[PDB]
Structures are given as structure tokens and as C-alpha cells.
Design a protein around this ligand. Structure first.
Ligand SMILES: [Mg+2]
Ligand SMILES: [Mg+2]
Ligand SMILES: [Zn+2]
Ligand SMILES: [Zn+2]
Ligand SMILES: [Zn+2]
Lengths: 122, 91, 73, 620, 56, 181, 42
């Protein structure tokens, strides 16, 4: 366990993690101990820089909107949906394959259409 | 430095001074107590890690500083099927 | 105290309840510490000999004081 | 990170099985005279004792290595001797088939509520415990088993019975088996245990019947070399020796009776392992007649000293310590920015000189012995954070002790004042608290190490802070003998000290420059000093006190007070006014211990720095 | 409004121990002694930041 | 996949660091105590984000330092079983393929690459299929699913994740996209 | 709270020695020697 007790946890997208990792990196610029990021943390940053398909804020907004779309879409599943950006029904299938509920073709298209926004265009 | 010699420091109220004379300058032994269990946990060289009996590696155990005599006493009571559950209290 | 006058030792005050440890080292007491401990129900403390036998600061004297200090700066 | 509490109880089989490092199955010891390592009772991932480090995953060499517990899967349940009477008191107080405490709803409701009013007093809880016992023991109609007539129990040393019914007017006694008893205690719900002497969580009744026997670690069973095997180990060997036979007979053919004999035998052996000095149990002796001492026989069955010499020339809180003793006793001082120079000069002076040192402890913790090698390259780039063990310096906190230690006043904190020769010097007024004289009396000297300890002693146990005794409202540290005689001569009607005497001797105290010594009261006979005035040169300028002296008696009692409702023609009723000694003479009434009238006043009104001063300067 | 003896001793000891393990001392500059006496002089000036939380 | 933890713990601020704001100081201690470590429960502790609030200081007999009840934010990473992830091949070996999916690497066995007979090209650094000419090498982007997690030590480099791309909708993006038609 | 209590939480004495004045600090048993304090008026 980290510390004495865990009071709150949240599932986070790669995009949001990219911002947090960049902060931790920029914080060093720390002078007295400098505090360099350990190797795997630097690796995680690089991977995050490359796989963050959305901007930090639009990723949050998409995550919240997907959560309010259905009850069977929790924070973890929504975060995964934002990380993957499913294009069609096949992509939705593999995401929910080992999950609690499997979306019908109809509600799958609802998710896709919501995710049809926010797509980076460039 | 026996009974009355303890009672004098007690009378003045010098606790630190007691421990100072009777323990800290002899055999101070450190054992790891589980928080929700009360049973002394377990370190491990070769692998370098803790793990209490009832709770498995996962549970954060806390260090406790004591005279070896009491550790031996806990052990003896425990061999007699008595459980000396240690109620920790925070730093 | 207790509602009746009782001797200051063994069959009275020293003889009564404190914590098991204040009778655990009660001189090899078979029919006591063996009897007291053979009844495993509860256990408190905040005594005196219990803490010195265990390696703890006695709760008398300074032990009943707690420090505090804000660290800026 | 320290111990708040300890909560005793009874170990569950699950615990003993989980807290075990390995299942002990082979009834054997070491064997023999070469190669002491087996696979049952000895270090089979269990514990280390020989100069060989191998262990249970934790490696941990013989040096520093907390022992690991083991377990034994008992082929059959076994009544714990320690609970025997308790188990009995439980059995004939509760219902079989039921699990109820044989008490009406009402009885439980008002009993528990009478059980919370007593929940702390161990002595007064047993009265109600046994009372409850007897009240249930008389009934035979419990409120949770349509009542089926309870065959009273019998006992001892570890056997149980039940005088059941099957014929009619008969009273045959069905024997009782540990399996039966245990499985009969497992029915008693958690709700009823509080009404007894047990716990639902800490101490279940079923656990009183051992199903698994916890094996003590190797570290708790050390071998006493000449090897003199450990008793526990031997008895354990017998226990497993029968246990395996039992299990092997259960797995094979079952003539029942055989299993019963073996079961009861196992019972005997465990009974002996718990307590060899038990009642009704033949003590398992070693082949010599000498009884084995098991568990119930197991938890049962920087200073200096020298002669003392007086010294009214040192401060009352100071102690004379022979510089040789000062060179042996050392103090741990961490090098910081204020003593960087001092400690470096100290360690450079080596174990010799006088202000030297003997050891040095670097931050890693390794102790360096300054003897060998040289103080040269050792005393280099010490850097801050190290630790020097310097010899005793003038002023260090030190405990002075004289046995027997009656009151607390027997151990007092002093200030080292390093001096040659070979005795402890004690300032004379500090003799009453120690009850020391001189003829040959020797005292102890303690040197505390941690800064917290030193401070605590210096703040709370210092001599000056204990001039008054807690026994009675009065000072304990004061004038002894000559102090009294000297106070008298100094404060006498005919006390006229020539300049030579006053001037040269006031240097035994202090305090003059301007408006102190002034101005020579008597130039009548000759210019001279009245003793009253010289004494007056010490008391502060506001203490006005008056109390009859020792001689204010017999027909010389008199009186002639006069309140304020200035000359001087009085003698007895000692009158001191703003430091000025108007009338009176100093004696056992004036100074000295026990009293309660002057030294007392200057310590209440002005306690620490002044009290010591008045004391110190008066003796001299 | 004041401290008890035990609290005084305790605080002094604590500060001294703080000073031993490093930790710069407040206003002291020209001295030449142990951390104990440093905390002691610091206390004589009432600059010891150690507060006694009393259970009340 | 990542997670944000808001945890209240107790931090011991050394006396040597009383010349630093408690939030900053405790932040340093916490970073030096937790960062770079795999907590089996939570996962890879990437970084202590910050120190929200800190309680009063308490001195304990023996230590002399200052213990505080702090509250802080951390970022962690746990690779749960059967979780779908996307990554980049960061190492080529004659027996398998390591794929960066985050702060750790995920090993994919050669028998779990593609629906075709795969052989390791020795002279070059790639895997080649017999029937289908699909080739996988260094710097390639893939999508796989965790099939096993080996959590040994808290040391991130001693724990190992196993994955496969032998399922519909997995593998290199060009395969995925070209198959949709 | 100025109370002498046994280590098992049992109020043995509501306010020590009835008055709460340490015998080492009292004027021969008296809880503040009143006749002395009054005289102190100069
Ligand atoms: Mg004498
Ligand atoms: Mg003598
Ligand atoms: Zn545990
Ligand atoms: Zn071991
Ligand atoms: Zn019944």
C-alpha cells in the first residue's frame, strides 16, 4: 500500500497522464536535489507523448461524456475508450470483450458517434 | 540498579533516563508488528522483504522497538496457545 | 477505595487488578500469572512496570507529555 | 512505532498453522557428535543456532535472527490443561444440543447490564462469573433445546464424564472425548461467550481444545553445550512419537479401543508438555530422576564507585570526580559547528593529556578506537555528523548515588568538576539527602549518554532544585554541624571582626563593590565590624522575617515584641529586616535541615539561583 | 500561562537532540559548547519552537 | 492504464530540513521513499504529484525529528489481466518481442505474434511469416492484450508482463486497417 | 485534570491530596501560609 490509507482513486487517460508527467519532468528545475525521473518514468513519458491521441482537456471532456452515456461505462472503461479511440464495431468488440456487458451494434454506434467528435482531425 | 533505584527515577519522573540506563545500553531488539493482526510480522534476508502470518505481504506492518525479554515472552505465551495481540498506537 | 478497607499488599492493593504484566512477573506465581493468563479475555495498560518491562517510556513523569512544533521555517 | 497495547487471548488452529514456517513431522533431535541438521524438529527452514547461516528464506545468520515458529497437526484433539477447569466450568453451565447459557431472557438482559458496570475489575468479575455458573448449574431446562436433561459433568486431571440416562433410574457415566467436547463447544454462539469468561473474536471456546500444537523456535530451544539437549525438545519428541503412531493407526485398521488408548496417551504427553508440575500428572523425568522443567517451569522458577571526601569549596550542585575516573567515563558528543574546534583538539590530545578522548563514532556507525594507530590521520576531515567520546569535562551532567536509596533524594544530578586524587568530593550541605558521612562510605557515579537523558537529569534532578524534602514542608539540604556553630559565632552579641578578618574572608563569598560592605557600625571601642552586619551582607533587601531562636525558653522566654502598630536592644526573637540582621543569633533554629523558617522562606520566594547562592556562600 | 518542570525538561531535551542531528540553531553566533547548552541558552531567550500540546 | 491516488499518510520531516516549507519538504521525503517502486496493490508509482494539506508537527521521544499527518497526490500504473493495450516494439530478440505499453515492457512470444508460421530473421532484426509476408521489427506499433502478470519484487524491472497479438483486432495498425476491407 | 488515577482508569482521588498542593511546595502542610502572605506588604 502507498502510505497509511488510500482515500480516493481515479482511472486516468494517457493524455491526462502526459500532462502530469511533463509537470513532474519540468519540476527539476528542483535545485537542491534536482530530482531526476527514474528510467521507466522517462520511458512512460515518451510513450505518453506519442500515444496521447487527444489534448489533455478534450480527453477529460470525452471521458466524462462517455460515462454519462451509459451506466455500464464506468471511469476505467471510459478512460480506455479515450486511449484507444475505437473507429467502428470491431474496435468496440475487443474493448468490451472481457468486460461485464457487451454493447449491441446500436449502442456501439452511439459510443462511436460520440467519439466521432474530438477526433484530432490533424 | 534495582527496585528502589528504579523507583527513584520514577519519583523524580525521569523516564527517558530509566530506559537510557536499563535498556538502550544493552540489548535493544526491533520487531515488526502487524497493524490489524497484533502478531509480530516477518522480515526476510535473501529476498529483503516483510510479510505477516495472517496478512500476506500486501499489508503494511509497523516497526516496534523493545527489550528482547518481552519478545521472548510473546513467543512463550504464543507457544501456550495464548494470543498476545499487540494493539499498536500511532507515532 | 473499592468499598472496603484492604491490606496494602498481596491480599489487598498489590493483589488486585492492574494489568496482567503487573502480576505476570508476580514472583513465579503458578496459581496467579498462570491463573490470570489462562483467562484470555482482554488486556489494557497505561501502567508503570508493564512499560519498563516492555522497553517503553513509563507514562508517569515526562512520558505524559506530547510535543508539537510547526516546521516553517 | 511503539507499543500502545497488548491484547491477550487464545490462539486459533488457523493462526498456528499460518504462523508456522514448516510442518514438523519427524520426532528426532540433531544426531550426533557430527552433522547436527535434520528435517523435522531441527532447522528445516525454522531457525539458526550454530555458526551456519542457512535458514527459512530469511537467511539471517546465527548472529541476530528472530526464531520462527512451527506447528504439529495433532492426529486427535487434545484438552489444554490450562483451560481444564475453565472448560469444565463452561460445559456444565451451558446446554448440549442448544448452545445457550441456560438463562432466561430477563436474566441475560440484566446480567450483561450488571457485567458492564464491572468491566474493568478483574477481582470483582469472578464473583459474578461463579455466581452465574452456579445459577446455570442448578437448572436442567435451557431456553434453546426443548430441554434435554443434562448429565452433570465430572473431571480431572484431564478427563470428563456425563451421568446420562438410557435405562430409567440409572445414572451410568458416558465417557467424554476431546473430539466430542470440542465439537460441542463449537455450537455455543458468539452471543453467549461474553456472559462467560471468553471472547467471540479473541478467545473462542473450541480453541481451548488444541487441534494443532505450536512448536517453539530453535532460538527458544538453545542447546546447552558441555550436548545438554533442551527439555522442551525431548518432550516434543515424545509427543510427535505418539502422534505419528496414532495417525498411522487411524489410517489403517480401527479396533476403536486401540485408538482410545493411544489418544489418551497423546493426551498425557501434551499435558506434560504444557506443565510438568501439574496435578494428577506423573512428571516426565530424564533418565536420572531429575524432572524436566517445561513451559510452566520456564517463565518461572557507564558508572563508577569510590570513597567520598568533603569539599565546602565547590558549588553545592557540583561533584568532585577524580580525573582518572573522568578519563574512563566518556560522553557521546556529535560534532557540530560550535564544538568543531573543541572536539578536534580533544581527539588530537588522544587518550592521554587531560581533555582528550578514547573513541570516535562516524555517521556509518563504526566505532573507532583511538588507542592504537595514532590521533594523527584519525582526526582528519571529520566533517559534521561524527561523534567523539570525550573525557569528562567540568560541568557535565552526572548522577550521584548512595545506597541504600531510601527516598528519591538519594540520587541527585551534579556538575562534574574534574580534580586529581582518587575520591568523589561532595559539598557538605548535600550530606543529609544522601545520608552520607565519611568514615568509609562509598558512592556511585553515573554518566548518561543521550542528550535527552542528560538534559532531563540537569533540568529535574539537579541539586539546587531539591533543597526541600517532599516528605515534610521543609528544607533537607542545609547546615550540618560547623555551619550551625559558625552561624552562631558570626551572629553573636559580641561579634567584632577587625578589617583584616572581614575584608579578607568575604572573598569566600562575594558581593561588595559599593553600597554593600559599608560602613563600620562600631568605632566606639575601635573601628570594627559587628557580626550581625557582616551576615546582613547576604540576605536580599526585602526579606523581613521573625522567629524565636532556640534559647527563647525557660525563664529566659520573655517576649517584649511590639508590632509596627530604629534602635536595637533585642536578642532572642530573631529579627531580620530587608537583609539587615537586627536581632537574633543563627543556630539550629536559624539554619540547618528539618527546621522550616528561613532557608525555607528564601526557596519559596526565590527558588533556584538565589537559594543555591545563599547556601553556598553561607557555609564558607 | 507557564510550563511544568517535566514539560520544560522534555522540551529542552528535544531541542538539544534536534540540534545534535544537524538543524541550524536560532540566534546564537558567538558560543562554544554542546547542543544541550545551545538549546538551554535558546530556551533562556524563549525562542525554542517546541510547543506542549496539553490534553484538555 | 493509469490511476490518480489521493492518499493521507504520515511523513517524518528531518531536523536538517526545518529550513524548507513543510509541503515541499514532505514532498521530497515522500518522493525519495515511494518513487521508482511497484506497489503490488496500486502498481508502478510514477510520481508524487503534490502535497495538498499537512497537519501539525509532533515530536516523539527518541527521534527528535518532526512527524506530520500529510495528504498527497500520486500517479500509479497497474497492468490488469486481459486488459487491451497499444504499444511500441522497443527490443528485438531471437525468442520474443518486447513492447513498451507504458512504464514497463510487455513480452510477446513468437508463437503469439500472427496467424501464420513465424520465423526470426537472424541476419536482420525482424520476425517474418511464411504464408503472409508480414514483418515485425524495431520501432513498430502494435496492439496487444495482457495474458499474464508476474509481480515479483517491488523493483519494476523484475516484474514481467506477457501479451499476444493472435486475436481479431490486434497486431500492427496497418494489418488492422487493411483487414477491415 | 489534576486527578490521581490508577493505571486502569479508576479515579482514586478527585484532585490530589484534596487541595492539589504538592507537599514539597506547601508551607508545612498549609495550603498557602496565609498569615505570611498578608504580612508581605512593604
Ligand atoms: Mg553520618
Ligand atoms: Mg558512613
Ligand atoms: Zn499479520
Ligand atoms: Zn531465522
Ligand atoms: Zn439446549
Amino acid at each position: 500500500m502507498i502510505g497509511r490509507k488510500k482515500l480516493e482513486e481515479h482511472y486516468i487517460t494517457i493524455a491526462e497522464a502526459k500532462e502530469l508527467l511533463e509537470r513532474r519532468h519540468a519540476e527539476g528545475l528542483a535545485e537542491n536535489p534536482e530530482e531526476p525521473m527514474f528510467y521507466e518514468a522517462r520511458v512512460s513519458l515518451e510513450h505518453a507523448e506519442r500515444f496521447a491521441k487527444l489534448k489533455p482537456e478534450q480527453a477529460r471532456e470525452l471521458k466524462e461524456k462517455l460515462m454519462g452515456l451509459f451506466d455500464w461505462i464506468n471511469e476505467r472503461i471510459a478512460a480506455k475508450l479515450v486511449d484507444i479511440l475505437p473507429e467502428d464495431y470491431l474496435d468496440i468488440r475487443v474493448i468490451f470483450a472481457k468486460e461485464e456487458y457487451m454493447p449491441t451494434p446500436e449502442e456501439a454506434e452511439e459510443i462511436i458517434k460520440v467519439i466521432d467528435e474530438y477526433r484530432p482531425l490533424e | 540498579f534495582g527496585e528502589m533505584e528504579r523507583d527513584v527515577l520514577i519519583g523524580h519522573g525521569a523516564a527517558m533516563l530509566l530506559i537510557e540506563r536499563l535498556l538502550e545500553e544493552s540489548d535493544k531488539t526491533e520487531v515488526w508488528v502487524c497493524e490489524s493482526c497484533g502478531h509480530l510480522a516477518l522480515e526476510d534476508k535473501r529476498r529483503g522483504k516483510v510479510y505477516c502470518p495472517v496478512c500476506g505481504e500486501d499489508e503494511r506492518i509497523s516497526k516496534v522497538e523493545m527489550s528482547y525479554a518481552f519478545k521472548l515472552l510473546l513467543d512463550e505465551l504464543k507457544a501456550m496457545v495464548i494470543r498476545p495481540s499487540l494493539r499498536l498506537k500511532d507515532r | 477505595l473499592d468499598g472496603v478497607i484492604r491490606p496494602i499488599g498481596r491480599h489487598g492493593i498489590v493483589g488486585e487488578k492492574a494489568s496482567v504484566l503487573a502480576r505476570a512477573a508476580f514472583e513465579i506465581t503458578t496459581q496467579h500469572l498462570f491463573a490470570a493468563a489462562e483467562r484470555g479475555e482482554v488486556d489494557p495498560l497505561n501502567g508503570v512496570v508493564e512499560n519498563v518491562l516492555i522497553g517503553q517510556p513509563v507514562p508517569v513523569g515526562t512520558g505524559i507529555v506530547k510535543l508539537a512544533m510547526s516546521l516553517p521555517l | 512505532k511503539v507499543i500502545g497495547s497488548i491484547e491477550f487471548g487464545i490462539l486459533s488452529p488457523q493462526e498456528i498453522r499460518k504462523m508456522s514456517a514448516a510442518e514438523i513431522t519427524v520426532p528426532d533431535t540433531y544426531d550426533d557428535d557430527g552433522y547436527p541438521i535434520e528435517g523435522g524438529l531441527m532447522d528445516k527452514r525454522l531457525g539458526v543456532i550454530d555458526p551456519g547461516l542457512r535458514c527459512e528464506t530469511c537467511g539471517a545468520r546465527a548472529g541476530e535472527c528472530p526464531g520462527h515458529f512451527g506447528h504439529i497437526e495433532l492426529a486427535r484433539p487434545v484438552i489444554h490443561v490450562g483451560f481444564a477447569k475453565t472448560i469444565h466450568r463452561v460445559l456444565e453451565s451451558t446446554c448440549r444440543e442448544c448452545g445457550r447459557i441456560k438463562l432466561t431472557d430477563e436474566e441475560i438482559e440484566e446480567y450483561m447490564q450488571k457485567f458492564e458496570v464491572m468491566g474493568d475489575r478483574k477481582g470483582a468479575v469472578d464473583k459474578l462469573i461463579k455466581e452465574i455458573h452456579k445459577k446455570a448449574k442448578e437448572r436442567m431446562v435451557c431456553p434453546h433445546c426443548g430441554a434435554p436433561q443434562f448429565p452433570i459433568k465430572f473431571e480431572r486431571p484431564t478427563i470428563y464424564w456425563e451421568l446420562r440416562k438410557d435405562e430409567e433410574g440409572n445414572e451410568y457415566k458416558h465417557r467424554m472425548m476431546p473430539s466430542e467436547v470440542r465439537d460441542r463447544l463449537e455450537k455455543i454462539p458468539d452471543k453467549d461467550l461474553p456472559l462467560l469468561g471468553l471472547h467471540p473474536e479473541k478467545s473462542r471456546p473450541e480453541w481451548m481444545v488444541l487441534t494443532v500444537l505450536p512448536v517453539p523456535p530453535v532460538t527458544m530451544r538453545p542447546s546447552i553445550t558441555l550436548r545438554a539437549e533442551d527439555d522442551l525438545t525431548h518432550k516434543l519428541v515424545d509427543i510427535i512419537r505418539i502422534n505419528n503412531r496414532l495417525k498411522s493407526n487411524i489410517e489403517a485398521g480401527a479396533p476403536q479401543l486401540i485408538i482410545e488408548d493411544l489418544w489418551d496417551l497423546l493426551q498425557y504427553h501434551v499435558t506434560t508438555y504444557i506443565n510438568n508440575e501439574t496435578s494428577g500428572v506423573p512428571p516426565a523425568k530424564h533418565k536420572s530422576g531429575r524432572p524436566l522443567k517445561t513451559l510452566a517451569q520456564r517463565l518461572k522458577g557507564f558508572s563508577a564507585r569510590t570513597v567520598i571526601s568533603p569539599d565546602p569549596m565547590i558549588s553545592i550542585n557540583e561533584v568532585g570526580v577524580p580525573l582518572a575516573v573522568a578519563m574512563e567515563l566518556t560522553v557521546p558528543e556529535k560534532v557540530t559547528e560550535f564544538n568543531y574546534e573543541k572536539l578536534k583538539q580533544r581527539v588530537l590530545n588522544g587518550p592521554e593529556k587531560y581533555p582528550g578522548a578514547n573513541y570516535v563514532i562516524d555517521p556509518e556507525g563504526r566505532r573507532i578506537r583511538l588507542m592504537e594507530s595514532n590521533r594523527e590521520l584519525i582526526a582528519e576531515k571529520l566533517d559534521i555528523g561524527w561523534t567523539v567520546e570525550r573525557h569528562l569535562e567540568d560541568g557535565d551532567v552526572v548522577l550521584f548515588n548512595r545506597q541504600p536509596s531510601l527516598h528519591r533524594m538519594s540520587i541527585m544530578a551534579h556538575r562534574v568538576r574534574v580534580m586529581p586524587y582518587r575520591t568523589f568530593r561532595l559539598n557538605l550541605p548535600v550530606c543529609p539527602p544522601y545520608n552520607a558521612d565519611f568514615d568509609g562510605d562509598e558512592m556511585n557515579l553515573h554518566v548518561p549518554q543521550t542528550e535527552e537523558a542528560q538534559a532531563e537529569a540537569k533540568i529535574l534532578m539537579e541539586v539546587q532544585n531539591h533543597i526541600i524534602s517532599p516528605r515534610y514542608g521543609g528544607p533537607l539540604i542545609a547546615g550540618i554541624q560547623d555551619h550551625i556553630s559558625g552561624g552562631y559565632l558570626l551572629t553573636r552579641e559580641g561579634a567584632y571582626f577587625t578589617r583584616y578578618e572581614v575584608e579578607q574572608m568575604l572573598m569566600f563569598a562575594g558581593m561588595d563593590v559599593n553600597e554593600l560592605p559599608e560602613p563600620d557600625k562600631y568605632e566606639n571601642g575601635e573601628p570594627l565590624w559587628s557580626g550581625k552586619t557582616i551576615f546582613s551582607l547576604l540576605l536580599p533587601d526585602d526579606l523581613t522575617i521573625w522567629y524565636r531562636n532556640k534559647l527563647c525558653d525557660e525563664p529566659e522566654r520573655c517576649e517584649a515584641l511590639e508590632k509596627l502598630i530604629r534602635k536595637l536592644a533585642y536578642d532572642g526573637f530573631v529579627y531580620i529586616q530587608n537583609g539587615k540582621l537586627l536581632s537574633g543569633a543563627v543556630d539550629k533554629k536559624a539554619y540547618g535541615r528539618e527546621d522550616g523558617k528561613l532557608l525555607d522562606i528564601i526557596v519559596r520566594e526565590y527558588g533556584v539561583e538565589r537559594a543555591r547562592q545563599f547556601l553556598d556562600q553561607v557555609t564558607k | 500561562f507557564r510550563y511544568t518542570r517535566f514539560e520544560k525538561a522534555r522540551i529542552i531535551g528535544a531541542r538539544a537532540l534536534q540540534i545534535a542531528m544537524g538543524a541550524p540553531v536560532l540566534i546564537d553566533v558567538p558560543e562554544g559548547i554542546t547542543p544541550l547548552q545551545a538549546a538551554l541558552l535558546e530556551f533562556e531567550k524563549g525562542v525554542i519552537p517546541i510547543t506542549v500540546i496539553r490534553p484538555s | 492504464m493509469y490511476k490518480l491516488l489521493k492518499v493521507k499518510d504520515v511523513v517524518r520531516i528531518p531536523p536538517r530540513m526545518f529550513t524548507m516549507d513543510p509541503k515541499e519538504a514532505a514532498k521530497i521525503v515522500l518522493r525519495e521513499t515511494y518513487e521508482g517502486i511497484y506497489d503490488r496493490d496500486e502498481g508502478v508509482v510514477l510520481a508524487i504529484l503534490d502535497v495538498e494539506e499537512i497537519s501539525e508537527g509532533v515530536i516523539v521521544p527518541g527521534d527528535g525529528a518532526t512527524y506530520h499527518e500529510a495528504i498527497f497526490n500520486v500517479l500509479v500504473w497497474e497492468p490488469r489481466n486481459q486488459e487491451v493495450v497499444e504499444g511500441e516494439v522497443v527490443e528485438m530478440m531471437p525468442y520474443g518481442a518486447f513492447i513498451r505499453i507504458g512504464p514497463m515492457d510487455g513480452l510477446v512470444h513468437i508463437s503469439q505474434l500472427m496467424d501464420d508460421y513465424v520465423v526470426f530473421d537472424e541476419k536482420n532484426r525482424q520476425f517474418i511469416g511464411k504464408e503472409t509476408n508480414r514483418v515485425l521489427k524495431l520501432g513498430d506499433y502494435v496492439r496487444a492484450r495482457i495474458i499474464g502478470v508476474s509481480v515479483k519484487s517491488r523493483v519494476i524491472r523484475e516484474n514481467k508482463i506477457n501479451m499476444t497479438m493472435r486475436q481479431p483486432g490486434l497486431g500492427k495498425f496497418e494489418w488492422i486497417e487493411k483487414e477491415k476491407k | 485534570d489534576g486527578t490521581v488515577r490508577d493505571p486502569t482508569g479508576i479515579i482514586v482521588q478527585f484532585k490530589y491530596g484534596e487541595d492539589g498542593v504538592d507537599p514539597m511546595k506547601s508551607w508545612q502542610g498549609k495550603t498557602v501560609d496565609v498569615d505570611r502572605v498578608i504580612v508581605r506588604t512593604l
